[PDB]
């Protein structure tokens, strides 16, 4: 029973256009509730889920300060990083950061996050002990020295165990009728002849929340690990997710195959067959 | 808040 509060930011330098672009988003579990886009009339943190619009003007005015402060940081970071890696100011580059908190079934902080990536590659990240950093490269080991010197981690640990967990608790309460009520998948099997010797079985899982699901095929009680197709879990667009898995089978031997669905919205696991 |  895990819940999480996460922020993700993408900073992209645009040489030749002259100004960088910052896009920030925040999720509670698998539900996006805020966004910030610096390419707008005069950028503001806006709501993207109903359980957060009920918050007042001093929330929105505070989260906008927080975003713009973080954009100022990402703006310095992009130039500094060009320095560290010895690059021209002619290429376009990308900064990514992510921070937040997991709340366990213990009511306590399970895991905390503070990590960055430069040009798709890891740069620096908080260790799961929440005391030390993991720096991928020489350049990053700079930042590591600077951050161990001002002792930034204790400061950030205090945010995670404090204001972060409590916001997560407040959001979970405001949004309880969507965020704490799992939606079980609707499931069915479909049959599509490939030849007169083979056929396709496709197991569907539709309309579920949260996004974590296990969908597998078995032939006579054993799991198929080769010859199967799984599309990655995808959003419907309405707050729910879909997935399917498909297996190719000998004609007439379809009833030997079972699909197995595990999901937090199910009382217990589901086992289903193609129903003619 | 920390800068790289």
């Amino acid at each position, epitope marked *: 029973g895990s819940h999480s509060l996460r922020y993700f930011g993408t900073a992209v330098s645009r040489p030749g256009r002259g100004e960088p672009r910052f896009i920030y988003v925040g999720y509670v579990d698998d539900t996006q509730f805020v966004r910030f886009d610096s390419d707008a009339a005069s950028p503001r943190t806006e709501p993207r889920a109903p359980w957060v619009e009920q918050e007042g003007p*001093e929330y929105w005015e505070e989260e906008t*300060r927080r975003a713009k402060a*973080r954009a100022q940081t990402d703006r310095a970071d992009l130039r500094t990083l060009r320095g560290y890696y010895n690059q021209s100011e002619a290429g376009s580059h990308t900064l990514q950061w992510m921070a937040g908190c997991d709340l366990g079934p213990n009511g306590r902080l399970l895991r905390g996050y503070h990590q960055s990536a430069y040009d798709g590659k890891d740069y620096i990240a908080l260790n799961e002990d929440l005391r030390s950093w993991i720096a991928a490269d020489m350049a990053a080991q700079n930042t590591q020295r600077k951050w161990e010197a001002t002792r930034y981690a204790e*400061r950030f640990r*205090a*945010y995670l*165990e404090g204001p972060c967990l409590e916001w997560l608790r407040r959001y979970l309460e405001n949004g309880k009728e969507t965020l704490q009520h799992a939606d079980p998948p609707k499931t069915h099997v479909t049959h599509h002849p490939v030849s007169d010797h083979e056929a396709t079985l496709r197991c569907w899982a539709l309309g579920f929340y949260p996004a974590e699901i296990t969908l597998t095929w078995q032939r006579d009680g054993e799991e198929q690990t080769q010859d199967i197709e799984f599309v990655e879990t995808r959003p419907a667009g309405d707050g729910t997710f879909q997935k399917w898995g498909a297996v190719v089978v000998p004609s007439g031997e379809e009833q030997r195959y079972t699909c197995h669905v595990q999901h937090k919205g199910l009382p217990e696991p589901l086992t289903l067959r193609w129903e003619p | *808040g*920390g800068a790289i």
Partner: T-cell receptor, first 108, second 114 residues
Framework: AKTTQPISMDSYEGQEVNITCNHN???????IMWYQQFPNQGPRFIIQ???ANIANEVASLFIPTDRKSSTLSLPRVALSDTAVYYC??????????FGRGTSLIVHP | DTAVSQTPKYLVRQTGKNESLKCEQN?????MYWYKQDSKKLLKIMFI???????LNPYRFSPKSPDKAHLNLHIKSLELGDSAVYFC???????????????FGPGTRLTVIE
């Protein structure tokens, strides 16, 4: 974010001083901070925290789980501890609203 | 030694004249603050700067920030209400959730006279 505390306080040298602040409209993002000021000098940071208890080399602060009061403790006070003590709460962290504060006098 | 330094320490000037308060910190901090403290002893924020940018706020008072270590206050058309001790401060950073203690300069005590 609006704090209330005793106006004045007396103490004998060597005793432990406890100052109690009240913040009933404390929001979720707010930290609790205590600053010190001598006459004619810039205010000086003492201690800050979000919950429970925090403790450093100079003082300590206790926060009940309800978070709407806090208590600053000065362990063994010297005469160089005579000063005005401010209790601050929130502001996004960098906008500081100082109040009247508490005037602590330590006596020989 | 490392600290927020401020000059001058005392100042007496006539109304209508113009004046410059200068603040300097060699702590590596990026965020700087100006505070006004009137005779009824309450500290009111005036300006907040971060990495040479206005964050918070008359254009009698015109802060200047040539670089990140200096935030200077240039005042025009002095009036009687301008009499206070002006404290300059700085922080490692503006928070983005976590918070930073502020370090304060020694103040400039400014009296304006008719």
């Amino acid at each position: 974010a609006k704090t209330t505390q005793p106006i004045s306080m007396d103490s004998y040298e060597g005793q432990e001083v406890n100052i109690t602040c009240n913040h009933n409209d404390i929001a979720t993002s707010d930290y609790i901070m205590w600053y010190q000021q001598f006459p004619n000098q810039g205010p000086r940071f003492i201690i800050q925290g979000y919950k429970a208890n925090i403790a450093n080399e100079v003082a300590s602060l206790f926060i009940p789980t309800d978070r709407k009061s806090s208590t600053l403790s000065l362990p063994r006070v010297a005469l160089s501890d005579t000063a005005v003590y401010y209790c601050l709460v929130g502001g996004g962290g960098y906008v500081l609203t100082f109040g009247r504060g508490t005037s602590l006098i330590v006596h020989p | 030694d490392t600290a927020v330094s401020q000059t001058p320490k005392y100042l007496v000037r006539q109304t209508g004249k113009n004046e410059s308060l200068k603040c300097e910190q060699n702590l590596g901090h990026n965020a700087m603050y100006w505070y006004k403290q009137d005779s009824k002893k309450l500290l009111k924020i005036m300006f907040i700067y971060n990495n040479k940018e206005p964050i918070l706020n008359p254009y009698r008072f015109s802060p200047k920030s040539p670089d990140k270590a200096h935030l200077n206050l240039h005042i025009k058309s002095l009036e009687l209400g301008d009499s206070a001790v002006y404290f300059c401060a700085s922080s490692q950073d503006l928070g983005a959730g976590e918070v930073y203690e502020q370090y304060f300069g020694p103040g400039t005590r400014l009296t304006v006279i008719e």
